[PDB]
Request: fold
Amino acid sequence: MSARRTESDIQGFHATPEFGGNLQKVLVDLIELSLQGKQAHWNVVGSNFRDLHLQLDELVDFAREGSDTIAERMRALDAVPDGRSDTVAATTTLPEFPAFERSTADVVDLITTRINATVDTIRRVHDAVDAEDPSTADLLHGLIDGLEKQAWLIRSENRKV
Amino acid sequence: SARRTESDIQGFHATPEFGGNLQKVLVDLIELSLQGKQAHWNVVGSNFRDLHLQLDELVDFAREGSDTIAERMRALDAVPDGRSDTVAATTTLPEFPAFERSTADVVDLITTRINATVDTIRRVHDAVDAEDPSTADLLHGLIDGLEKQAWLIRSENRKV
Amino acid sequence: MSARRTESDIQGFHATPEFGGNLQKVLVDLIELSLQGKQAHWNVVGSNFRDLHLQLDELVDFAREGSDTIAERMRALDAVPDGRSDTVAATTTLPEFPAFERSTADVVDLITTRINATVDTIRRVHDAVDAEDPSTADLLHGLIDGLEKQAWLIRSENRKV
Amino acid sequence: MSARRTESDIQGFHATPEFGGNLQKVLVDLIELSLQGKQAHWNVVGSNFRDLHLQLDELVDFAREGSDTIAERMRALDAVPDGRSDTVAATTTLPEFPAFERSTADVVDLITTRINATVDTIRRVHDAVDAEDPSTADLLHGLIDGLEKQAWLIRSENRKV
Amino acid sequence: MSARRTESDIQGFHATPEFGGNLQKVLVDLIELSLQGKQAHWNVVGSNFRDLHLQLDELVDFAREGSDTIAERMRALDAVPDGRSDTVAATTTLPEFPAFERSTADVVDLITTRINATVDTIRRVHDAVDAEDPSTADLLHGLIDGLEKQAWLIRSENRKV
Amino acid sequence: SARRTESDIQGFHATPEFGGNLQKVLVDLIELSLQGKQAHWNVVGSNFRDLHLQLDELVDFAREGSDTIAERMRALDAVPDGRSDTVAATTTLPEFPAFERSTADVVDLITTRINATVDTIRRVHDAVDAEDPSTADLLHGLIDGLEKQAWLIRSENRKV
Amino acid sequence: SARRTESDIQGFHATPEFGGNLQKVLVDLIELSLQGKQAHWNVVGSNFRDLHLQLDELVDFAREGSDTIAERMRALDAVPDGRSDTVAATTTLPEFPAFERSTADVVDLITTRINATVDTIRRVHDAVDAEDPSTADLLHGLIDGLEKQAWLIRSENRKV
Amino acid sequence: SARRTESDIQGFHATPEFGGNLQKVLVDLIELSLQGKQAHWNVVGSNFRDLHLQLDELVDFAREGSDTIAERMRALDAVPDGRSDTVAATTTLPEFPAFERSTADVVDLITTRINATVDTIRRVHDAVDAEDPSTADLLHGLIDGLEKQAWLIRSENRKV
Amino acid sequence: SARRTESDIQGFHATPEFGGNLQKVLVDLIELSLQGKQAHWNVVGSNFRDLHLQLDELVDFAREGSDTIAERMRALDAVPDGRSDTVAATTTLPEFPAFERSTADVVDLITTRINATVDTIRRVHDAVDAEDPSTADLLHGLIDGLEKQAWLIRSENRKV
Amino acid sequence: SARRTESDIQGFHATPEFGGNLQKVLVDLIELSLQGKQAHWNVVGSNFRDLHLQLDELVDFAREGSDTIAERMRALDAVPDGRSDTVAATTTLPEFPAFERSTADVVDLITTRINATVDTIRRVHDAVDAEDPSTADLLHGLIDGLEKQAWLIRSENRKV
Amino acid sequence: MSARRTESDIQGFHATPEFGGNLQKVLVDLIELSLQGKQAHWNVVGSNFRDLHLQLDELVDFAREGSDTIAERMRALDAVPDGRSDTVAATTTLPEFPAFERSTADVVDLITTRINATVDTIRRVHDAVDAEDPSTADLLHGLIDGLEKQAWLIRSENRKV
Amino acid sequence: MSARRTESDIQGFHATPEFGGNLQKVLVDLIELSLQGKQAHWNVVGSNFRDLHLQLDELVDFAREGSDTIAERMRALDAVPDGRSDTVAATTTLPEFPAFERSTADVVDLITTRINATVDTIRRVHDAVDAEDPSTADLLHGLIDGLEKQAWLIRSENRKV
Ligand SMILES: [Cl-]
Ligand SMILES: [Cl-]
Ligand SMILES: [Cl-]
Ligand SMILES: [Cl-]
Ligand SMILES: [Fe+2]
Ligand SMILES: [Fe+2]
Ligand SMILES: [Fe+2]
Ligand SMILES: [Fe+2]
Ligand SMILES: [Fe+2]
Ligand SMILES: [Fe+2]
Ligand SMILES: [Fe+2]
Ligand SMILES: [Fe+2]
Ligand SMILES: [Fe+3]
Ligand SMILES: [Fe+3]
Ligand SMILES: [Fe+3]
Ligand SMILES: [Fe+3]
Ligand SMILES: [Fe+3]
Ligand SMILES: [Fe+3]
Ligand SMILES: [Fe+3]
Ligand SMILES: [Fe+3]
Ligand SMILES: [Fe+3]
Ligand SMILES: [Fe+3]
Ligand SMILES: [Fe+3]
Ligand SMILES: [Fe+3]
Ligand SMILES: [Mg+2]
Ligand SMILES: [Mg+2]
Ligand SMILES: [Mg+2]
Ligand SMILES: [Mg+2]
Reply:
């Protein structure tokens, strides 16, 4: 006849503080990566300027989309993101991007390292995130895949022979 | 040459339990889509337009979801049943009420029914994943998208 | 201000209980049709699978747009639709769609019959709808036209000449 | 040449003065509605501003397309529209829209009333239009349907249940 | 199963021979119009060539969509269209389009007359069509409206005021 | 830290004169749009189609213009009045005539009324620019686009 | 300066034979388009939908083709005649039958009539090419596209 | 004949002070984008959806703006700094508060932060305009677009 | 403060065995694309058009898949080999037969070849998943998409 | 097995005479584009708008054409020269007159200049075709497209 | 009551000969830049060929759009542009582009200089244009901004460290 | 009266075995080029990586479209293509692409040579194809033109001064 549930209030999945903190770590590194990516995009000069200028904007697009995905995943699971500038600066694990113009070769090396750092944060929190919520780990997989692709597309400029 | 011979390589086939598990997800997705449209038409009051619009996006997602699940069943040699009698008789979702409903009531009602739908997917997840990880990925997309819908809808009623 | 009306409140056209009832009958058959169309879409097998699989989705798209149109027309005229599963199952005039895989030949005949039942419901209510509100009768004409087109496009598969 | 007519000049269907007059009445109320819709769009303030601001532009889009449709239908049938500011102001049946900023609650009620007055004009002329030219009555059905949809979408904001 | 019908076969609405005949008359005039429209499109020369050349293609697009609509409506209602060259030539009511290059002034008058003849055919069959099937009459309204718009857009070139 | 404190930083607000100046531009833009449609429907004769089409582009521009100006007013705490009575009572544009009008007449009539509209914007420009340069940029777009429309329309009647 | 003087450089003009040759291609293209629509509406039976859809693509191509040829005629100072009487009286295509026709019959009928149309283009090709190679390129596009249509349609009836 | 004979002609160079002025605009645009996203995620309550959506539109505009300014800097051989430390250390915007915030609070908070960003642009405007009018036009685009966002957002809390 | 201090931090490196596993997937995806095109061209008979079209959809998916796998290899510093000799020498797929083939035969042939490709992905899945879960998700996308293609194609020959 | 064993195989090389032939086409296409824009700006009178619009379509085609020719030159290692001095010094087109010109005059002027451009292509055609048939096909595209433009434009002045 | 003006003829803004001449100077340099940009686009060879090939086409697109904008602004203000090849060659201030293939490095330097020259013309005429017509100066600002952006995007290839 | 042909069966153009074999030669080289192009696309590293990565994908797109065009032309003319991997490997005339990563400079040289080889096959079979069927030769012209353009766009990277 009927399999319908009777509750007037069915709660959603609530993330633990640890899980919330793990997604927060991913978030600040994705935002920092986005900010560094734009810095590089503006300030790269030299041989093959245009390709890097353009590829960096694609990296920024992906990182911005990723940061929105992570922050909104946090919101869906009743966690509260902090993407404010002071928090990002105080808590990012990425080495700082240097000031002023940088050569194409240096930008390639610098950004590759910073992508590598961002991915490392995602890989570090992965198993804990997966254990609590496999659906969030899938979002992490997309970020890993997308960012490591960016790393290859950027770094290959400096790879010799 | 590493070429195989077999002129009849059969596809991966779902166990009856696996098919039954996807059938559970399917009816709740269809029921959610029907309830979402009902809410979409009959919601009234403060912030009507936002709710009206958001509910349709929920329905879009839930419909795409039901098709995905039903066709995954087909791919794995299982047979979906999305007929009205079956949905009404087997859905775990609390019945959505008839008639006009306030935006505040619709927010609470629909959030409960999304959560009910997610709960079904979360209930079958581990058994699905154990048999076929590729199908559990489809479940993850569903969980992610619906829990996003719950957040976007319920936030309307959130106080301070 | 010459021809301007001075009423503070000007009320809209309100559907009679008979009118509301008549559109409700159309609504449940459109929704039932959509549900059966998907069932057929998923479970059809055999000769010319792909064409039928594709046409059935087009039928479903039209029936879904149709049900939304009718339900929203009800709302516009201060009537209240009921498109819930229990109501559709309990009140649809469509012959039940069978379970399990069905041959393309079977599906063509089954769906043609169910489309025709849906159109019949619309044709049955048409004159009473038209008498109260010509504008709504026009929406019914769209449905009759579009559904009868679907019936021709599907049924022609089984036609032997 | 078997069934071919041999007339050098075959004249088109020409609207009667009554018909032309009736479409003119629809035209001025559609234009007045568009103008008031923009006024409301600009000057609405308060709770749920954005939704109302957006819906009012959709109303205006529909009313503008509607007025163009009516005026061009007049032209097609050898009638002459007058959509000039003085004429619209002097001959519209719509209650004047108030000046200054208006609350969202106020705007909902005000615009619902003005939409309803516009629809009333169309409903009043409908039968006389339909008697002379069924094809034009169909354009009126489109307007009635679309405007009553707009009224429902707007008015529902103020509905307390 | 409460309100569900139990008929194995539910047949669709079938057009009478009179109805089928009436739509066939519309069909041949729409196709003749399309053919003449292309002839005019290609062979028009003189003052305001480009505008006429372009408008004639829009007329042809509408007439082609119209003929497809009518023929498919026939099919939907178990009637059989005949749009073959011999049939169109033998049974069209349109005055023959002249051969060779034609001035823009000449083309405006010629095409206006042929559009009007096409609309006349639709207007002549309208009431008999509407009496049997209101849904098809609505398709006729679309054709009347669209073709009379075309006539206005074309004929206005030759209007001296 | 260079961070400011103030929890209530107010926006730039237009003087009454500034608001009045934008109101002047607004009514002429709306009136032009209404006259443009009137011409669009009622133009007849040689080169009807081009004029019919061009007039609609004029109307599109003038409507986008009126919205831009009215919303700029809103941004600066001014209140537009685009109602029919106000437009008829306060527009500086010579009245467009009723009834069918020849393409040659429509070209001359509409050119005059575009020029009237541009003249209003040119009349208020310096006072607008002195108070708010950002708003004068919107005026420049209007001047540029409308004077383009005048050229595209009037060239029809240009002899040799 | 390598600038020429001539204030009246005339265009390439087609001989009467060339115009007559393009006229031949034109009527067969128009007739094919009319027969294609007839088949599109009246085809019934096994695989109706594919045939119904493919026939419309044939018609699209044939219509674009007829316009291309007729306008090429215009470019070269020739005058097309695509009127119904002329098409019926001068087309080389076997008459398409009235009434409902099976998909199998429609495949055979339409293939024959496409081949008839291609044959016309192939018949006039060398004479067209000798006078104007640029026009023969248009003929090649027609041959290529129609022979593709023939393959896509006839393959339905191909046994083993 | 009128051709200049230098093998390399130099482009326009921004003074370092001009560069510093655009840098002030840049950091507040970036700060505003970051705060807008914070608000976009964390806003809850009555009319959540409209605010959530409008805040993304604000961020889109602010991100486009910061790109425009940074690339204008580069065109004139100034060197932007949009790094997190620099933005945090030098922005004039009041810090956005942590945690969930009501729609009413978000409206007032974001309006103030938009108004602060506009204030920076208005403050540097004249010094920028004096050196390079073309850059001032970009500033006008920002003032116009941001003040529009301020109106669109603050209107939610306006009581009349 | 929390910033890491290495000038160069290394990314994730795939073991050569992991690389070899993706290489197995790659060659079968490329082989499947090549066979799918062969079938697409050479299929004849009843329901030709649907098969012709569906086979192109399969090829689109397989080509996108092989690109995804090859680029995942590159991301992790493995080196793909999609050259014709390598594909022919190392594919596990049964060879596709030459010449025209009936729609019924093509359905059975292509279903088997899809099933072989899926089998390869399923065979390497666990070893891939153990080293890099993110790559396994790409494998799941392929399994899901290919098994869908298998169902869509094989359904033609299913008799119920 | 059938693989060629040269490490570098040379591509097809255009003779310098072939290069010079395409160069003749190039300068007249560029000249035509420049004159077409001149006419586009300066045309006045009866049916201004159609001419203004058609002239832009001509220019679009001529610009696409000149790019096609210049890039064909580069493909075959010829080196185009589209510089203003070279175009002015070597074009075969009669100079376009200065100042405003009536629509009737523009029609006749532009038709002649199109016809001159076509004449150049037709003049070099056979020498181009003899060396490289693939390039001649590009010439055919130009002849066809330009002769279409000639008909579309000149038809305005045709009296029948 | 009424604020309507009474003139049957209201003239538009007419540019002085000096203003007309100033826009003419901008026009010939924009056209020359477009022609040189295509020359460079075709004939650039060497390291980073593709990026420059592509960026040069974007420069050409902008310069062509700019030349149309300036010429049409002239037309709007009753001035008469001259974009003919002989005039452009005789009156452009740009140094001539050299013949034959050029290296990527040389093309970067050459084109940067020619953009710089084009912008200089716009900057030279600016204040005079602005004094007479501020709305035209705004168009000049767009050209300056757009072209200096192109200069940066092109020149950065050759900028070292 | 009537020019209609009387045959119930009109056959299409059938290609000779030689013609079929000539198109087969073009086909295997186009497929081989596509496979080598993707290999290069994945494995190119070094200075100007991105441009080559991207340009190679465009080459692949063109070659794949070309191979479909040739195979389908064969089908239209009753010939039977063989694009299977073993056939392509056994019968392609292209030198083999080397294994593993290759520098940008080496990839430019290698791919240019392989395009040159592919075009050479098309040029070798051209006159024979043209003699039998001029319409197919036109398709060959498009391939020659499109591929030689790719060759220029790729090779220009390595061309010095
Ligand atoms: Cl919204
Ligand atoms: Cl036009
Ligand atoms: Cl299909
Ligand atoms: Cl690029
Ligand atoms: Fe995933
Ligand atoms: Fe997983
Ligand atoms: Fe009716
Ligand atoms: Fe209708
Ligand atoms: Fe300014
Ligand atoms: Fe040829
Ligand atoms: Fe501007
Ligand atoms: Fe060609
Ligand atoms: Fe978001
Ligand atoms: Fe589906
Ligand atoms: Fe809806
Ligand atoms: Fe209109
Ligand atoms: Fe059709
Ligand atoms: Fe607006
Ligand atoms: Fe045409
Ligand atoms: Fe940028
Ligand atoms: Fe790729
Ligand atoms: Fe190019
Ligand atoms: Fe232009
Ligand atoms: Fe294909
Ligand atoms: Mg590059
Ligand atoms: Mg809202
Ligand atoms: Mg089929
Ligand atoms: Mg015209």
In short: Residues 103-131 of chain J form the longest helix (29 residues). The interface with chain F takes residues 43-50, 52, 100, 102 of chain J (CB under 8 Å).
